[PDB]
Design an enzyme around this catalytic site. Structure first.
Site, PDB file in Angstrom:
ATOM      1  N   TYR A 251      -3.836  10.842  14.645  1.00  0.00           N
ATOM      2  CA  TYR A 251      -3.387  10.985  16.020  1.00  0.00           C
ATOM      3  C   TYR A 251      -3.536  12.409  16.539  1.00  0.00           C
ATOM      4  O   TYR A 251      -3.084  12.704  17.649  1.00  0.00           O
ATOM      5  CB  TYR A 251      -1.936  10.518  16.146  1.00  0.00           C
ATOM      6  CG  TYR A 251      -1.124  10.709  14.886  1.00  0.00           C
ATOM      7  CD1 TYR A 251      -0.465  11.902  14.632  1.00  0.00           C
ATOM      8  CD2 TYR A 251      -1.016   9.688  13.950  1.00  0.00           C
ATOM      9  CE1 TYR A 251       0.276  12.076  13.480  1.00  0.00           C
ATOM     10  CE2 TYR A 251      -0.281   9.855  12.795  1.00  0.00           C
ATOM     11  CZ  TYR A 251       0.365  11.049  12.566  1.00  0.00           C
ATOM     12  OH  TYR A 251       1.101  11.213  11.416  1.00  0.00           O
ATOM     13  N   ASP A 252      -4.150  13.293  15.758  1.00  0.00           N
ATOM     14  CA  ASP A 252      -4.452  14.641  16.204  1.00  0.00           C
ATOM     15  C   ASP A 252      -5.777  14.667  16.961  1.00  0.00           C
ATOM     16  O   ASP A 252      -6.515  13.680  17.019  1.00  0.00           O
ATOM     17  CB  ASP A 252      -4.506  15.598  15.014  1.00  0.00           C
ATOM     18  CG  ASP A 252      -5.217  15.001  13.819  1.00  0.00           C
ATOM     19  OD1 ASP A 252      -4.540  14.382  12.973  1.00  0.00           O
ATOM     20  OD2 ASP A 252      -6.454  15.149  13.725  1.00  0.00           O
TER      21      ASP A 252
ATOM     22  N   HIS B 207      -4.766   4.401  15.904  1.00  0.00           N
ATOM     23  CA  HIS B 207      -3.323   4.600  15.911  1.00  0.00           C
ATOM     24  C   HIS B 207      -2.866   5.461  17.083  1.00  0.00           C
ATOM     25  O   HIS B 207      -1.760   6.005  17.052  1.00  0.00           O
ATOM     26  CB  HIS B 207      -2.863   5.213  14.589  1.00  0.00           C
ATOM     27  CG  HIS B 207      -2.839   4.244  13.449  1.00  0.00           C
ATOM     28  ND1 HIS B 207      -3.167   2.913  13.598  1.00  0.00           N
ATOM     29  CD2 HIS B 207      -2.523   4.409  12.144  1.00  0.00           C
ATOM     30  CE1 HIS B 207      -3.056   2.301  12.433  1.00  0.00           C
ATOM     31  NE2 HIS B 207      -2.668   3.186  11.533  1.00  0.00           N
TER      32      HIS B 207
END
Lengths: 616, 612
Positions: free
Chosen positions: A113-114, A150
């Site tokens: 999720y970065d 995600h």
């Protein structure tokens, strides 16, 4: 390296070349950038609700349950605040990101999720359509995706945008139907390489659970890059390979310390990158297999221009018009030199496998009929002996009629008959035959469309001359117009199977006048050079022009291509023959015309051109 | 393909079966009332469309001058440096800056700027073009390293760009762009191709027909140049585009010469060269290409227009030559590309009339600040003598050549051509005919016997000295033996044979006559040329066919004549032999027999100008 490891590298590099390679990137690559790991977030949450860190070790369920309990008890605002204070950080992109990008993946699927992959793509100047929410699937700006399955924090550092707690994983299929479907479709249609995963990851085992439901051998086994410190066990490797994974173990390839994760990742990534230029040719039969794989599609064509052979081998060698091969960009093992060594001496050819012996026989016949002799350092005395095996070239109109009247044995005979019909002027019948060939068919399929479009162009131009005699009925003209306006010759090659676009790349030039470009440029340069040498009175430039002329004529007539009637091709032939005749006239006072020269002059010169040649 | 857009600016309906929207647009363009009937937003959109079509040279339909806006094209290197120095306000300014850095030889800065623009550019057209140009400059850097194997790029930079550009595929670049870009900018896809000028090169074949096409070819060349320069694309510097320009211009000039010759044959009494044509030839042709043009076609019969603009361009070339070599300067990456264009421009300046001040600047730069490696003394003299064709020698150019000769004397010469500093003095004496060099005389007055190199240098430059300087120079050389006399006559020690020289020649010839059982041919040539009036040479007749061929042709046996003799003869000797009224028919018949045997160019040239 192990044989299976080399095979895995071969398939991965081939898929990368074909643009069908997709990298599935896990938390390991982000950890290589010292991105905050999830257990730190679980640690903070546990310190928050419970008041103290956990005494023991977090189980697999706990990593999702503790954030879930925190969200239920402390609410959404505290969860998002901890997420923001932990994840609103700037971290660099590790060399593994650049290594993944340098493989030119079609898409990049990530559970991270970065924005580290996004930052790497923006730094490398690789544009990806970043999909992290459901609305991004339909609004994707390109066909190449950065699929964050995600979510991410691009909208904001909230738990609604990401899949972190156990409720997000429970309701993932319901909350991310489009994204999950896109991920499964990308898996089903691409070569998948897993990197940054631990072989016990939740996502890996969920993907294997989906894989077990697929039809047997209806999918390609994804590749798994294992970067654990200890080598994989034999039983674990067997189990996961029977589960549908092709595992490449970093610990088996190299030796490194327990905490040298970066070196383990870099070993596999560099070995994948450094094998892109590699061809994995060591022994003699590997030479014959590669050259056969490159040349066998060309067996469908009667003749191949030697200047086109440098495109077949991706500029590894120079194929000069005199029949000599020159190393051009082959930094690896020399397969052409080895092939010629096998050709000259029968001893090494004898120690070849049966299939590869037959393949070498086919390659030797192809190179013999194509005039490819040897390497430049071996070249001796070479003669410019040309033969054109075409009834249309020699003006065998009666024999052409006899062949036309005969029943067609095969689609190759149909193609030759259509070319003969075009050469005999019966353009309507040739067009109908070309349409029939296209229907009944993909080398011939592609060449008939080019010839049908070329014969349509010839029909249109002749009709204009008469009107500006009714050879073609208005019904025929209307029908061919209806069929041909939608057809565009520029995208015909791209409207082909990807196998055709790689096996028959040299046939792409027949769509435009790029076919004559290299010969035209060489002809202009050699015209200037020959005229300068003649004026000052001082291999031969005239032989180069003659050999290129003969190569073009043989390729266009033996392959039955209607480009022989092009005005540009006639101008090229006329210019080359005029230069040759000028040089021959100068060479006399210090070269002679054969039957082929006479035929070329008769077919391609105008009376004014001949008059000018006699004057000069 | 709905319409045909022609190079002259006319539109022709081609394939659309629907509404004639381009014809309609032109109709609104003609009449203001219909344009006024449009809605406000559509009115402003029509205004933008009209401005675009005016700028791009689209005027009207078929039924109803080149100008490139580029500092790089016009060689405004100082203005480009100024633009680079300033702060960029937009990303298009950075794109232009990166192109200007590429054109100024600063390829590392250009690559860095292109990378920065790629970072900050995600229409995405400047992003796509920067990716194209960064790959092109990466190709330029890679090929320059191979040529130099001087280290103009640090190994760290080379390794970094190799790592950055590894596995990078320009063929995938357009397909990787958003489909909105791929639909709107489909015309930019050819910039990622390996080749893009094949259609024009194949269309060049219409200039070889012997049975408008030339204006269409020229306008298409102008279109390509304007597109590649105004849009700041680095492909304008590669071999493919230079070769395309060379082929197009050469074929155009050859075609014009062919029509001129055909008309002269059929009528018995074409190409117009202007500023842009001159710049194209200077930038894209090599000296060999210009020489091929000169030998194939009579460029002196081509009228040169816009000569003020060409003169300004040449003056800028000379100024940049000075700036590159007067100061430290020496950007080797820029110098490599610029020196070829400067050489071609100064070579082609023979056909352009130049003002006195501009000629002074150009001649000074050519004589002094042009590197010896690219232009040696013989080539430099050839360039100068070409410059003296359209405009004769003024006093200022003679002074500049005088300073050049003085500098040569102070230095005292490798010449591939074979022409040395003496030829500059001969050229000065050709026009002024009475020029005396003050500083050369001054350095002769300081000459001693020790510095032999100065003496043997400016003994060739003797006519430029004064009487006292000549007398002082003559003392350091002796004419004792015949070998010294021959060295002097080849160097110019004496211009009028004294009786003692005649006695020395007699002694030499008698000594060789006694020893019967190179110099003699020269003696016979001089005897024919009235250089020596000894009237005694007849006793040395019989050994060399040339000797009796020259001293007395009346009794000469012409079966012993070798036609290869005339090739070694000079202009004055051939003219004197032509006007002798004797020997004339013999050389006529031998040259006729030679040419009938074989069409030799030099023999025909000899037979034709002087009729020998």
């Amino acid at each position: 390296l192990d044989n299976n490891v080399v095979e895995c590298i071969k398939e991965i590099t081939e898929s990368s070349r074909n643009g069908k390679l997709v990298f599935f990137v896990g938390a390991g690559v982000s950890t290589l950038s010292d991105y905050p790991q999830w257990w730190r977030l679980v640690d903070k949450y546990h310190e928050e609700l419970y008041g103290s860190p956990k005494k023991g070790n977090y189980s697999s369920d706990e990593y999702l349950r503790i954030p879930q309990i925190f969200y239920n008890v402390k609410g959404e605002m505290a969860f998002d605040g901890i997420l923001k204070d932990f994840f609103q950080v700037d971290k660099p992109t590790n060399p593994i990101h650049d290594k993944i990008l340098a493989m030119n993946p079609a898409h990049v699927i990530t559970t991270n999720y970065d924005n580290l992959i996004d930052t790497a793509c923006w730094k490398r100047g690789k544009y990806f359509s970043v999909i992290s929410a459901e609305e991004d699937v339909a609004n994707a700006t390109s066909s190449r995706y950065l699929l964050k399955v995600h979510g991410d924090f691009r909208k904001g550092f909230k738990g609604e945008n990401v899949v972190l707690k156990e409720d997000d994983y429970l309701n993932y299929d319901q909350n991310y139907p489009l994204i999950s479907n896109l991920m499964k479709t990308i898996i089903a249609t691409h070569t998948i390489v897993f990197i940054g995963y631990g072989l016990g990851d939740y996502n890996i085992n969920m993907l294997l659970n989906w894989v077990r439901k697929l039809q047997k051998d209806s999918f390609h086994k994804p590749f798994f890059i294992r970067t654990d410190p200890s080598p994989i066990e034999n039983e674990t490797l067997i189990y996961y390979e029977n589960k549908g994974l092709r595992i490449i173990d970093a610990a088996s390839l190299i030796d490194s310390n327990e905490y040298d994760y970066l070196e383990r990742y870099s070993a596999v990534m560099d070995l994948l990158i450094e094998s892109q230029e590699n061809k994995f040719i060591t022994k003699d039969d590997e030479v014959i297999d590669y050259i056969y794989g490159k040349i066998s599609p060309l067996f469908a064509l009667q003749y191949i221009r030697k200047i086109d052979l440098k495109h077949v081998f991706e500029y590894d060698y120079h194929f000069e018009v005199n029949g000599t091969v020159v190393r051009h960009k082959n930094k690896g093992f020399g397969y052409m030199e080895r092939f010629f060594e096998l050709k000259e001496s029968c001893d090494e050819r004898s120690k070849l496998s049966k299939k590869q012996y037959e393949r070498f026989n086919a390659l030797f016949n192809f190179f013999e009929k194509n005039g490819v002799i040897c390497m430049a350092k071996d070249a001796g005395t070479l003669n410019t002996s040309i033969e054109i095996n075409s009834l249309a070239y020699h003006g065998k109109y009666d024999v052409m009629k006899k062949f036309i009247e005969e029943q067609s044995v095969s689609i190759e005979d149909d193609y030759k008959k259509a070319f003969f019909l075009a050469c005999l002027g019966r353009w309507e019948e040739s067009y109908d035959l070309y349409s029939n060939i296209i229907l009944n068919s993909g080398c011939v399929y592609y060449l008939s469309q080019i010839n049908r479009y070329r014969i349509y162009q010839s029909i249109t131009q002749a009709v204009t001359q008469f009107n500006g005699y009714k050879p073609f009925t208005d019904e025929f003209l209307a029908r061919i117009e209806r069929e041909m306006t939608n057809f565009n010759i520029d995208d015909l090659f791209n409207g082909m199977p990807f196998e055709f676009q790689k096996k028959y790349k040299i046939l792409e030039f027949l769509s435009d006048n790029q076919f004559l470009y290299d010969d035209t440029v060489k002809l202009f340069e050699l015209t200037n050079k020959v005229r300068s040498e003649m004026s000052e009175g001082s291999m031969s430039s005239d032989i180069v022009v003659l050999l290129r002329l003969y190569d073009n004529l043989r390729f266009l007539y033996e392959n039955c291509l209607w480009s022989v009637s092009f005005h540009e091709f006639h101008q090229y032939i006329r210019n080359s023959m005029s230069l040759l005749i000028e040089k021959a006239e100068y060479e006399r006072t210090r070269f002679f015309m054969e039957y082929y020269d006479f035929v070329n002059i008769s077919r391609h010169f105008k009376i004014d051109d001949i008059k000018n040649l006699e004057r000069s | 393909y709905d319409y045909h857009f022609e190079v002259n600016g006319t539109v022709v309906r081609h394939k659309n079966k629907g509404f004639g929207y381009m014809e309609r647009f032109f109709e609104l363009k003609e009449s203001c009332d219909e344009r006024s009937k449009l809605s406000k937003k559509q009115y402003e959109r029509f205004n933008a469309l009209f401005n675009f079509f005016e700028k791009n040279g689209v005027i009207c339909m078929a039924k109803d001058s080149i100008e490139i806006n580029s500092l790089a094209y016009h060689g405004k290197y100082d203005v480009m440096k100024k633009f680079i120095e300033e702060q960029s306000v937009s990303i298009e300014d950075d794109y232009k800056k990166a192109f200007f850095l590429a054109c100024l030889g600063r390829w590392e800065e250009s690559y860095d700027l292109y990378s920065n623009i790629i970072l900050n550019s995600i229409n995405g057209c400047v992003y796509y073009l920067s990716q194209i140009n960064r790959y092109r400059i990466y190709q330029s850097i890679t090929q320059a390293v191979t040529q130099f194997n001087y280290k103009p790029f640090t190994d760290e930079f080379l390794a970094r760009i190799e790592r950055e550009m590894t596995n990078f595929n320009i063929d995938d670049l357009f397909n990787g762009m958003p489909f909105e870009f791929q639909k709107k900018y489909k015309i930019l896809e050819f910039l990622s191709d390996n080749q893009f000028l094949y259609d024009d090169t194949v269309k060049l074949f219409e200039l070889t027909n012997k049975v408008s096409s030339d204006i269409v070819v020229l306008l298409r060349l102008y279109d390509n140049l304007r597109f590649l320069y105004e849009n700041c694309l680095w492909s304008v510097s590669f071999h493919e585009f230079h070769q395309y320009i060379r082929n197009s211009m050469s074929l155009l000039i050859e075609k014009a010469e062919y029509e001129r010759t055909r008309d002269i044959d059929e009528l018995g009494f074409g190409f117009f060269m202007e500023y842009y044509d001159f710049v194209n030839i200077s930038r894209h042709f090599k000296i060999d290409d210009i020489k091929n043009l000169e030998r194939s076609c009579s460029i002196d019969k081509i009228r040169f227009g816009e000569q003020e603009k060409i003169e300004e361009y040449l003056v800028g070339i000379a100024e940049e030559i000075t700036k590159q070599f007067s100061a430290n300067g020496m950007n080797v990456v820029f110098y490599t590309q610029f020196i070829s264009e400067a050489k071609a421009a100064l070579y082609f300046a023979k056909y352009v009339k130049l003002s006195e001040e501009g000629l002074g600047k150009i001649v000074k730069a050519l004589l002094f600040y042009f590197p010896e490696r690219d232009l040696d003394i013989g080539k430099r003299y050839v360039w100068l003598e070409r410059l003296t064709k359209c405009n004769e020698l003024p006093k200022s150019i003679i002074s500049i050549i005088d300073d050049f000769l003085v500098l040569q004397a102070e230095k005292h010469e490798v010449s591939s051509n074979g022409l040395y500093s003496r030829d500059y003095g001969a050229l000065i004496k050709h026009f002024e005919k009475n020029f005396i060099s003050k500083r050369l005389s001054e350095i002769t007055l300081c000459l001693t016997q020790d510095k032999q190199k100065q003496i043997d240098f400016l003994f060739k430059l003797l006519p430029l000295l004064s009487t006292n300087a000549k007398s002082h120079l003559l003392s350091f050389k002796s004419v004792e033996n015949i070998n010294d006399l021959m060295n002097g006559i080849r160097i110019g020690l004496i211009d009028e044979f004294t009786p003692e020289h005649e006695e020395l020649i007699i002694e030499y010839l008698e000594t060789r006559k006694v020893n019967y059982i190179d110099y003699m041919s020269t003696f016979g040539i001089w005897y024919f040329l009235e250089e020596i009036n000894n009237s005694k040479m007849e006793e040395f007749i019989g050994m060399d066919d040339q000797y009796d061929f020259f001293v007395d042709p009346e009794n000469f046996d012409y079966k012993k004549f070798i036609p290869s003799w005339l090739k070694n003869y000079n202009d004055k000797l051939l003219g004197k032999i032509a006007g002798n009224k004797h020997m004339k028919h013999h050389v006529i018949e031998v040259l006729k027999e030679r040419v009938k045997n074989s069409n030799d160019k030099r023999y025909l040239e000899i037979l034709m100008n002087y009729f020998i």
